Design a protein around this ligand. Structure first.
Ligand SMILES: [Cl-]
Ligand SMILES: [Zn+2]
Length: 378
């Protein structure tokens, strides 16, 4: 019990008890901060921030170090931001930050399970959903899920793999690290301790007679090269890159050193993805689009954020994907092979497929999210 212990390493035991009390209360965040004359611990539960303890300023340097080791961070470093992860099942993100009386730390505490969705719960529109299900059922080629960090690329990969997880396929994975176990799917973790890297593991994966193979991310030329070869020898391969557009995936493959022709004969599709917060149904306010907002699309009724208790910070509860699914055809292969560039590839793709903005803009029309939340990402 955190509170009993507070009355009294015991620092390891305090920190763990605090984490335990935080989950027990349903708290989303823990803050440890140093003030000149005192130290402070705050918890946020359901948006509400509060001071749960104010122990001696002298403990500060120690609570900061303790959290640092747990998240695998530099105790010697004090002048710059640091971020790491712990899994305890609870995904805790830890952020330390230089501050005039000492590094402030925050522990973000997420439910690992709410992140686990099925393929029809990602917010794909009917078309994208239909086409993505046909893409993942193909015998061979590369399917890439792309977007910046926090796009939820891990979730969609997992949803897709799960859609395929039948005893008629052999689905193997290499991950850094494994997010959770799927069951039916052989999952492998990159372990630096034995030079077990994305490249080595994926190489071994191919001697395991797989039908489908997942790579956590393609980071280097070598992992890309093996991925391209896997996909050209009869395997369906799925991965991520953190590019900002669908067509931008082609470019990054090229810039890394993959032969333009080999990108053009291996790539099946690129699912570019973003997360937008879904407006709180309770306090979401209708309004009538002014002339400048109509330019972006009778009275057009959209919705605005505001804020209530069911949301907290802002009028949003939960989030949902918006996508642009790039599908390789004959004419796109020519454009990839000939290195025509992003502008020519997009222009080709627009005949059949809307941009992410338009997909987001469609959801705004539906009143699922705000115009701000879609535009701010573009
Ligand atoms: Cl992601
Ligand atoms: Zn609300």
């Amino acid at each position: 019990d955190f509170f009993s212990l507070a009355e009294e390493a015991p620092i390891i035991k305090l920190i763990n008890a605090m984490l335990g009390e935080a989950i027990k209360e349903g708290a989303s965040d823990i803050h440890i901060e140093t003030f000149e004359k005192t130290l402070s611990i705050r918890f946020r539960v359901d948006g509400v921030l509060r001071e749960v303890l104010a122990p001696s300023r002298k403990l500060s340097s120690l609570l900061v170090s303790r959290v640092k080791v747990m998240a695998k961070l530099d105790i010697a470093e004090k002048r710059v931001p640091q971020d790491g992860r712990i899994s305890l099942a609870v995904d805790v993100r830890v952020s330390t930050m230089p501050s005039s009386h000492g590094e402030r730390v925050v522990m973000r505490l997420l439910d690992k399970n709410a992140t686990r969705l099925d393929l029809h719960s990602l917010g794909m529109t009917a078309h994208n959903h239909d086409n993505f299900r046909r893409l993942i059922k193909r015998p061979h080629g590369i399917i890439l899920v792309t977007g910046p960090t926090g796009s939820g690329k891990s979730t969609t990969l997992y949803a897709g793999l799960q859609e395929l997880n039948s005893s008629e396929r052999n689905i193997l994975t290499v991950e850094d690290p494994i997010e959770f176990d799927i069951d039916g799917i052989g999952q492998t973790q990159v372990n630096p301790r034995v030079d077990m890297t994305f490249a080595r593991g994926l190489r071994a994966i191919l001697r395991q007679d797989p039908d489908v193979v997942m790579v956590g991310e393609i980071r280097d030329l070598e992992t890309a090269q093996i991925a391209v070869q896997a996909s050209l020898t009869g395997h369906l391969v799925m991965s991520t890159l953190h590019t900002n557009t669908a067509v931008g995936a082609v470019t990054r493959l090229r810039d890394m050193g993959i032969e333009p022709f080999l990108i053009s004969s291996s790539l099946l599709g690129v699912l570019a993805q973003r997360l937008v917060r879904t407006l709180c149904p309770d306090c979401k306010e209708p309004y009538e689009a002014d002339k400048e907002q109509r330019k972006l699309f009778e009275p057009l009724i959209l919705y605005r954020a505001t804020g209530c208790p069911k949301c907290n910070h802002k009028g949003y509860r939960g989030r949902t994907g918006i996508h642009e699914l790039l599908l390789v055809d004959d004419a796109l292969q020519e454009l990839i092979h000939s290195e025509a560039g992003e502008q020519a590839m997009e222009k080709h793709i627009r005949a059949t497929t809307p941009s992410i903005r338009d997909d987001g803009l469609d959801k705004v029309r539906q009143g699922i999210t705000s115009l701000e939340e879609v535009m701010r990402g573009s």
